[PDB]
């Protein structure tokens, strides 16, 4: 038995024994509004698969930074602003 | 006069030196009376300087370009020493 | 079919205000060895998982992480104290496996009733060299 | 276009081809059979 | 996990087992030696490969002997 | 037999045991096991130790040899 | 009040004020991540909106357009961008860790030994149904912050 | 196996996270991967050397594809002393405008990086005169990888899959690849020099479409056959010809005039052209020597039992030595990445002599970049040479099939070996280091005349010995009169003379006392990773502290604290140690290479001659002093070309002493603090419903051995790439 007089062996309750406790995690219920309960469920059940979850994640991500970095000018990174400068000549003529 | 080393009896760069350290140990002996314990050390040590030289001519050591003793290790019979 | 296991009842623990060394996860899912020990007094021990515990007067029970921590625990006893124990291994299933004498003999006493394996008849030199046992699952040491 | 390739391709490599393999080599990783 | 080893020239002083903090080993009784004892390595499985035990065996090289191999998770000495 | 079968107590012997540390090199012979069911009963005392702080070990019969001198 | 976990002196850890208080245990047990009960759904929409807002935080104010007229726009952008990261993780995370249909390892007990009910959390399709709660949460969170620093900018700090 | 790792079940069978790493670690370690066979093993070689040959084309495709695409060769070719190379173009969206401004070169219209690769130059040598012909190259060398990666899938299946009988066919396979793989390959690149890259020198553009019709030279093949070859060496572009147009052009094709090209300062196209051709006909004929399918040949085998010496010196002689090298594949890895080292240390100190490039000796930076570059490469190519041998001496060695032997009465004097290169190194460490501080401390004291300095006799002899009369020793080539001199008095020599006594050019350098001194630290680090290579390979089986070392395998982290301690006692930490004074050892080769080098473009050849010396001087006047413009690659006003060697040299520093972290620290204490980081987190609220799945545990220590020296060496190399690319790119001399 747990509970008696320092004894924490119960070989019956194991979980008691080896420390499985949901140290906070309440079984109180949904404290939400039922309505706005069901419009996330109903708005987000299309991310119930994580498989496919994960192939929208990837390659609509992958397109999205495509997209971005492609139709971006060079106003938001200098990278693609490009030069807008003369070239300086290196040591020695150039080389 | 092998290996293109000129001997240092007869060097140009090696006397250079030689009159560089002795201006440098001057330079550091116009600061006290020239009867101290400073400017007799640093007398001393020029004639140490002068007469190491000297030595180094004498031997028939070879001064290359730099003005430096360059030993010969092949086995002359000169460079034994 | 000589010394038979002892099944640790529910026996007290020692007095302990509690440490951070001591059962992780491992026990919730793997085995945490639990240790019994009968002591003539209340007296006062190291405990493996760091910090002082006060041991009871008469049988205590330990779960502490691990085989090494019980038996360093009962070398300590046996050495320091000149106790009696004897360690279990509990998994979560709920079977207890009884391992430290394995015959009610510690393991220094040659006592007959104990088979030898990890046994190579051999000085350690006339093993064979790995080009002898090439593409075979016996490394070096099991022929 | 060709000024505006690597704007897609090194954002495409060095950000996308690691969420993908160190995705699916961290799957592979945590897998059983 | 740990393949443990002991060869024929133990003279059975029982070392390797005095020291073995995991109850690796376990002297036997044998014919080979004047303490009619040899050490055996029945929970292997036990073993994290601390090499107390050939640390404590006063032989030429070694008749214990501790191969490093499949390290579970309680050859690797795990609280967790 | 009976009667001593290996070296002399006092012999000094030789190592042929190629994993010992005094491999090749001489030994002094304290005791041999005159049972006749051991295997290594020659046991040597040598004059330098091992890695170990150890100058003395038990060898076979054809684990050694006896010098010259 | 430093008296051990469930008063169990061998497990590795204590009911010190900061863990078991009326406070902050009532606190860490009424928020989405301890919501055993509830499905994940509510719960990880919850965490996703509180973690978009947390993230466009800095990453108006602090990045490589702060200064710019871009920063509010393309530092949401970055926030959902690393939203859609973490949903990703977390996907993997849920797929490595538990694979279809097991049931949930969450422990079945509580401090006071009730036999309570697993939290399905910890079971494929309730993470999956976290990750999705993430995701939409996330978005929806990065974009009203982005509404809020659009229509709402002047009480909060520009500097 | 059951989970990530399919070639060891007993990784898979490992609940912490070591099995990731060693799952990494031992992915090639085939010979120790579970339940697999020789058939297999040589069989997953082979579709590995495919993968090899397909990654090496596809790089290589990469370079032209880059160069033609974001490079300006074009640009390149018509003023190549004056227009600098482009590996390839950067897209980094963290670049700010300066950084885009500053890495604008080579005429680019974008950022860019310079090809400090010399590809520019050896491609311009060959022919490829155009964007479109990289583009043909780079996509010719792709269908190549494809090809490759077919074969080795191919070869993998069940139909196609060579038996081990097959591979150890070590005399048809050494034939096939002596006679074709070499001859006939340097045989086809010659037929590239004269059909195309002379021509491509000469003038006229010789493409695939007009190949066949344009004479490679005015008489074809009727020298060839009729045997008039001196025909072939006519016309051989007399001093005044301008690489890439037909001025001061001539109509040879194979030449011996030797000596350098005086524009390009580069060796004749004519003479590589020679050069491949004669070698080609050298491997072609060496190539027909072992016995195959056709009756005639020679068994290896018997050559081996043959040459036992009588006298018993050599004992048993190369007796039983055929089969303990053609089964043990580790044995032919140890030999072919010890020919493969020196001849790469052999392309290092011949490139950097004798440019076989147009516009390579010119340009400072690829010069420098590819001597370091492949010396280092060289050392780690040795490196593993050695540490496969101790693989073999411990897996594939068998005592008994090679008693007595060459190799077994080798392991014998194991101690000798080591004694005496422990001597070696001991002798010239002390000496050298001491003759170093004596100059250093008579530097100190003001007086460099009393400095040790031993001019190099026996350099300065062979210098003399080949047409260098800077020393006056006048013998076998300076002397007019030595026979030696009058047998190539018409064939060589004058270019040959005019191209070492030539003072600009880089062969057979002007060395001094210096040299002499930094020659002898060279070979007190090639004895000493000789000594701690050999020693690890020769105590691999074992010793007196360890004797069934080839019972723990290669790698394993120690044998415990008992007799005495056992740290780093695998032959694995003997190549680990070796590692360490190996990269000691380029380091101090590529210092005295970039100093003295660069000292030479400067011009002031006397700041290495006497600041050499001594260490202060290497210390200030080479790491110091060519450290100015690197530093300043980004002040806080403003940055310039060489910010990112800053940045490089900084995380290069950053990385050899994060490796300082591994080595120093080892396993034990990290452990522990990672248990308690997993009491932490399984406590933490919020992040206990995140739970591993690998227990998490320290490094092994073998493994975070090799962290610490990836880390190390990693360091090592960007450091000093870092410094060495921003020091002659600075200036260029
Ligand atoms: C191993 C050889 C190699 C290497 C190291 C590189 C290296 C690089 N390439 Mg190139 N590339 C190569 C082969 C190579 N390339 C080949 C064979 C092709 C033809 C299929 C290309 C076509 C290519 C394009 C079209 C672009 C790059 C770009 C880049 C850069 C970013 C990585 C990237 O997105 O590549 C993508 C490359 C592939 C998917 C081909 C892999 C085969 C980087 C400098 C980008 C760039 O210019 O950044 C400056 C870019 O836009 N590469
Ligand atoms: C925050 C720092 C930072 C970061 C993130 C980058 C990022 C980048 N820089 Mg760099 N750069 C920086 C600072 C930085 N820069 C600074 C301060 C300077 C000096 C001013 C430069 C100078 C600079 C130059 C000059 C160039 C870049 C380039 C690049 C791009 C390389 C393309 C790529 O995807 O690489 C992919 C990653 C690699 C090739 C690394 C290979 C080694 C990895 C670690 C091992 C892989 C492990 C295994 C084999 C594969 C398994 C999968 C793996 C994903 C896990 C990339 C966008 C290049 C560029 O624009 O070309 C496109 C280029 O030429 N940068
Ligand atoms: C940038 C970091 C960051 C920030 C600001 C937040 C912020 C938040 N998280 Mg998130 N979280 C994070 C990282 C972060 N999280 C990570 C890495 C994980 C994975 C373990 C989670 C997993 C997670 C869950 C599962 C939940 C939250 C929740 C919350 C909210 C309240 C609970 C809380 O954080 O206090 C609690 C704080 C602790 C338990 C840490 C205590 C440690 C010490 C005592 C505090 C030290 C702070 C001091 C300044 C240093 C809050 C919006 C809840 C939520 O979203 O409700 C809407 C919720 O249920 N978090
Ligand atoms: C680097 C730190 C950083 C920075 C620069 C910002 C910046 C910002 N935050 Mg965030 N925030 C942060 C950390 C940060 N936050 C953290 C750690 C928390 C607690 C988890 C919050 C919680 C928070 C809230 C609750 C809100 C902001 C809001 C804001 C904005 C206006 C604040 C007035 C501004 C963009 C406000 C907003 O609406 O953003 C537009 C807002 O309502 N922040
Ligand atoms: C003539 C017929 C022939 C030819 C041409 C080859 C060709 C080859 N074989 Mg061999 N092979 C043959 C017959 C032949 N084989 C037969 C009959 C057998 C029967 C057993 C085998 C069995 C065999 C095995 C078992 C393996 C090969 C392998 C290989 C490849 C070696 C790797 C490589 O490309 O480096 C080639 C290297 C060189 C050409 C030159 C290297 C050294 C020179 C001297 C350095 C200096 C010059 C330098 C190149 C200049 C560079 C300057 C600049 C251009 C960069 C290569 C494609 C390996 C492979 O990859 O598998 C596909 C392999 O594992 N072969
Ligand atoms: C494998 C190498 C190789 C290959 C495939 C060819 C192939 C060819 N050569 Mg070339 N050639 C080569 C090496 C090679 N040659 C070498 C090494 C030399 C110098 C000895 C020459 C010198 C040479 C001349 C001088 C001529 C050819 C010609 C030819 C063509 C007709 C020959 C009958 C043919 C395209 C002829 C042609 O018109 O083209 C021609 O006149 N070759
Ligand atoms: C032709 C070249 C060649 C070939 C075919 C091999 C092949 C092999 N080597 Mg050798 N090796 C080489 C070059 C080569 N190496 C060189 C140049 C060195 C010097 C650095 C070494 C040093 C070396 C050591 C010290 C060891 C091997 C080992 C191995 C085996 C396992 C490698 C593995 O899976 O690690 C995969 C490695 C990684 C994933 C990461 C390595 C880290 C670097 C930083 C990545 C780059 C395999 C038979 C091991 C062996 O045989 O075990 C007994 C072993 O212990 N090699
Ligand atoms: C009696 C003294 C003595 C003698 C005769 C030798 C002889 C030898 N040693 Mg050993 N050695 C000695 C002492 C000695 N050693 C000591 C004290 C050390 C510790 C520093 C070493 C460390 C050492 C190494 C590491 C190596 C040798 C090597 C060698 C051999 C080559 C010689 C050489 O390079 O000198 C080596 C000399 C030194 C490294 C300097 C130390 C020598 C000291 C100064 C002499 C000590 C004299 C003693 C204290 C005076 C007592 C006088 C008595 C009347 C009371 C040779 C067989 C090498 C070898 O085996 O290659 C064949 C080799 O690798 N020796
Ligand atoms: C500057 C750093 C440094 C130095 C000086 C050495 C020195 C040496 N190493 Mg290396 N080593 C180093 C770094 C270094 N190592 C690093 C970082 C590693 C990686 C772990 C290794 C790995 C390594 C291995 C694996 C091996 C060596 C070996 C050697 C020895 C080679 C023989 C030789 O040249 O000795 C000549 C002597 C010296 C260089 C010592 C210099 C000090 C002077 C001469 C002493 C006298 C000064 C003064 C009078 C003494 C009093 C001082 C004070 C108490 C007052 C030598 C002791 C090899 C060996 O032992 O071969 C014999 C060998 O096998 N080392
Ligand atoms: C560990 C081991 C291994 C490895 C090893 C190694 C890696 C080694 C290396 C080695 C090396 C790396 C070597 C080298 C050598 C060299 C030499 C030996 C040289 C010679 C030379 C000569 C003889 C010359 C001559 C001449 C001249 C002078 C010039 C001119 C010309 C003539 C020709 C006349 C093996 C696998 C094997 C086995 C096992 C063990
Ligand atoms: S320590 Fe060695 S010799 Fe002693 S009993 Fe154990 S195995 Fe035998």
Redesign the pocket.
């Known amino acids: 038995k747990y509970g008696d007089k320092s004894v924490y062996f119960d070989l019956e309750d194991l979980g008691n024994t080896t420390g499985q406790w949901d140290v906070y995690g309440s079984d109180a219920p949904s404290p939400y509004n039922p309505l706005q309960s069901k419009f996330f469920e109903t708005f987000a059940a299309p991310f119930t698969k994580r498989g496919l979850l994960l192939k929208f994640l990837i390659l609509g991500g992958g397109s999205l930074l495509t997209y971005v970095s492609a139709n971006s000018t060079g106003d938001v990174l200098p990278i693609k602003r490009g030069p807008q400068e003369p070239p300086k000549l290196g040591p020695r003529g150039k080389l | 006069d092998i290996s293109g080393l000129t001997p240092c009896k007869d060097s140009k760069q090696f006397a250079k030196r030689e009159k560089q350290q002795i201006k440098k140990l001057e330079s550091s002996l116009k600061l006290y009376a020239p009867e101290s314990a400073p400017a007799l050390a640093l007398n001393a040590q020029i004639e140490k300087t002068k007469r190491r030289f000297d030595n180094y001519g004498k031997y028939g050591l070879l001064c290359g370009s730099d003005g430096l003793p360059h030993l010969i290790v092949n086995g002359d019979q000169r460079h034994w020493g | 079919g000589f010394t038979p296991p002892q099944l640790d009842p529910n026996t007290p623990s020692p007095i302990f205000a509690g440490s951070t060394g001591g059962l992780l996860r491992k026990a919730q899912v793997e085995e945490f060895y639990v240790i019994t020990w009968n002591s003539p007094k209340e007296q006062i021990f190291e405990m493996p998982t760091g910090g002082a515990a006060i041991m009871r007067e008469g049988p205590n029970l330990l779960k502490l992480a691990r085989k090494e921590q019980c038996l360093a625990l009962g070398t300590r006893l046996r050495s320091k104290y000149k106790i009696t124990y004897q360690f279990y291994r509990v998994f979560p299933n709920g079977e207890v496996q009884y391992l430290h004498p394995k015959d009610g003999v510690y393991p220094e006493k040659a006592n007959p009733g104990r088979e030898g394996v990890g046994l190579n008849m051999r000085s350690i030199g006339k093993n064979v060299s790995p080009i002898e046992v090439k593409f075979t699952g016996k490394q070096s040491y099991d022929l | 276009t060709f000024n505006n ?6 954002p ?3 950000l996308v ?1 690691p969420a993908i393999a160190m995705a699916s080599l961290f799957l592979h990783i945590q897998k059983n059979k | 996990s740990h393949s443990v080893k002991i060869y024929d020239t133990c003279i059975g002083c029982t070392q390797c087992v005095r020291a073995c903090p995991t109850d690796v080993l376990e002297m036997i009784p044998w014919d080979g030696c004047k303490a009619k004892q040899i050490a055996s390595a029945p929970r292997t499985e036990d073993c994290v490969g601390c090499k107390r035990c050939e640390s404590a065996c006063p032989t030429d090289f070694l008749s214990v002997r501790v191969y490093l191999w499949h390290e579970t998770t309680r050859s690797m000495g795990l609280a967790y | 037999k009976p009667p001593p079968i290996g070296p002399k107590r006092g012999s000094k012997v030789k190592i042929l045991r190629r994993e010992s540390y005094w491999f090749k090199n001489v030994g002094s012979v304290v005791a041999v096991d005159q049972d006749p069911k051991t295997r290594y009963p020659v046991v040597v005392r040598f004059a330098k130790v091992n890695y170990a702080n150890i100058s003395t070990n038990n060898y076979a019969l054809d684990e050694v040899e006896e010098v010259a001198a | 009040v430093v008296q051990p976990i469930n008063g169990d002196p061998f497990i590795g850890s204590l009911e010190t004020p900061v863990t078991s208080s009326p406070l902050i245990a009532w606190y860490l047990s009424n928020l989405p991540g301890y919501r055993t009960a509830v499905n994940p759904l509510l719960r990880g929409v919850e965490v996703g909106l509180a973690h978009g807002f947390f993230l466009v935080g800095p990453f108006v104010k602090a990045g490589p357009l702060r200064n710019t007229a871009y920063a509010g726009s393309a530092g949401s952008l970055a926030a959902a961008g690393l939203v859609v990261i973490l949903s990703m993780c977390l996907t993997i995370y849920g797929i490595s860790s538990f694979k279809e249909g097991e049931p949930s390892i969450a422990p079945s007990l509580t401090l006071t030994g009730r036999k309570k009910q697993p939290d399905q959390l910890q079971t494929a399709d309730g993470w999956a149904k976290f990750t999705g709660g993430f995701f939409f949460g996330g978005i929806s969170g990065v974009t009203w912050a982005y509404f809020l620093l659009y229509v709402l900018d002047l009480p909060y700090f520009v500097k | 196996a059951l989970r990530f790792p399919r070639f060891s079940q007993g990784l898979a069978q490992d609940p912490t996270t070591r099995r990731i790493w060693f799952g990494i670690a031992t992915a090639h370690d085939f010979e120790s991967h579970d339940d697999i066979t020789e058939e297999r093993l040589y069989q997953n070689i082979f579709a590995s050397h495919f993968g090899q040959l397909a ?1 090496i084309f ?6 032209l ?2 160069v033609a ?2 490079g300006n060769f074009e640009t390149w070719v018509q003023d190549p002393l004056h227009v600098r190379p482009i590996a ?4 980094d969206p963290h670049f700010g405008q300066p950084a885009v401004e500053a890495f604008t070169r080579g005429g680019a219209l974008g950022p860019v990086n310079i090809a400090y690769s010399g590809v520019y130059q050896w491609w311009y040598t060959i022919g490829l005169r155009t964007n479109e012909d990289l583009y043909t190259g ?1 996509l010719f ?2 269908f190549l ?1 494809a090809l490759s990666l077919i074969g080795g899938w191919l070869h993998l299946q069940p139909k196609w899959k060579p038996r081990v009988s097959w591979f150890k066919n070590a005399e048809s396979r050494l034939n096939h690849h002596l006679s074709g793989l070499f001859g006939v390959s340097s045989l086809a690149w010659t037929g590239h020099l004269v059909h195309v890259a002379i021509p491509a020198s000469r003038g006229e553009y010789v493409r695939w479409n007009n190949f066949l019709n344009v004479l490679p030279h005015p008489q074809g093949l009727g020298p060839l056959f009729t045997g008039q070859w001196n025909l072939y060496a006519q016309n051989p572009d007399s001093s005044s010809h301008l690489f890439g147009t037909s001025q001061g052009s001539g109509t040879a094709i194979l030449t011996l005039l030797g000596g350098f090209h005086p524009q390009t300062q580069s060796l004749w196209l004519t003479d590589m052209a020679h050069h491949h051709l004669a070698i080609a006909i050298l491997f072609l004929i060496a190539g027909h020597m072992y016995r195959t399918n056709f009756g005639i040949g020679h068994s290896i085998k018997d050559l081996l039992e043959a040459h036992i010496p009588p006298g018993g010196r050599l004992g048993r002689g190369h007796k039983g030595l055929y089969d303990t090298i053609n089964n043990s594949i580790h044995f032919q890895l140890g030999l072919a990445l010890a020919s493969l080292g020196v001849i790469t240390s052999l392309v290092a100190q011949h490139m950097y002599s004798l440019p076989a490039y147009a516009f390579i000796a010119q340009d400072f930076t690829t010069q420098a970049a590819l001597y370091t570059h492949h010396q280092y490469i060289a050392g780690f190519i040795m490196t593993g040479a050695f540490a496969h041998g101790a693989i073999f001496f411990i897996r594939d060695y068998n005592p008994e099939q090679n008693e007595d032997n060459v190799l077994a009465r080798m392991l014998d004097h194991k101690e000798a070996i080591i004694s005496h290169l422990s001597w070696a190194s001991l002798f010239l460490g002390f000496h050298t280091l001491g003759l170093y501080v004596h100059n250093d401390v008579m530097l100190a004291f003001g007086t460099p005349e009393k400095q040790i300095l031993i001019e190099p006799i026996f350099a300065q002899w062979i210098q003399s010995a080949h047409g260098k009369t800077s020393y006056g020793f006048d013998v076998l080539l300076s002397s007019t009169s030595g026979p030696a001199f009058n047998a190539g008095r018409s064939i060589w020599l004058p270019g040959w003379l005019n191209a070492i006594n030539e003072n600009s050019n880089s062969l057979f350098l002007t060395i001094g006392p210096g040299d002499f001194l930094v020659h002898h630290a060279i070979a007190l680090g090639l004895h000493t990773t000789t000594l701690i290579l050999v020693k690890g390979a020769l105590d691999a089986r074992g010793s007196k502290l360890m004797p069934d070392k080839k019972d723990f395998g290669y790698s394993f982290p120690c044998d415990g604290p008992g007799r005495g301690g056992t740290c780093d006692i695998s032959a694995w930490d003997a190549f680990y140690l070796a590692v360490f004074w190996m990269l000691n050892t380029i380091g101090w080769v590529t210092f005295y290479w970039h100093w003295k080098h660069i000292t030479l473009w400067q011009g002031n050849v006397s700041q290495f001659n006497e600041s050499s010396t001594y260490l202060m001087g290497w210390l200030r006047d080479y790491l110091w002093l060519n450290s100015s413009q690197l530093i300043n690659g980004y002040n806080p006003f403003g940055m310039n070309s060489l910010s990112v060697w800053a940045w490089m040299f900084l995380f290069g520093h950053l990385v050899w002493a994060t490796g300082f972290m591994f080595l120093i620290s080892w396993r034990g204490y990290w452990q522990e603090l990672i248990e308690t980081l997993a009491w932490a987190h399984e406590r933490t609220p919020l992040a206990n419903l995140i739970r591993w799945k690998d227990k998490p545990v320290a490094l092994s220590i073998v493994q975070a051995r090799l962290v610490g020296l990836a880390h190390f060496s990693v360091g090592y190399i960007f450091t000093y790439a870092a410094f060495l690319i921003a020091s002659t790119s600075g200036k260029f001399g």
């Open positions: 390739l690597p704007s897609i391709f090194v495409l490599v060095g081809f | 990654i596809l790089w290589t495709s990469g370079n594809f880059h695409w974001q390839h173009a950067i897209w780079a060398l792709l990888s």
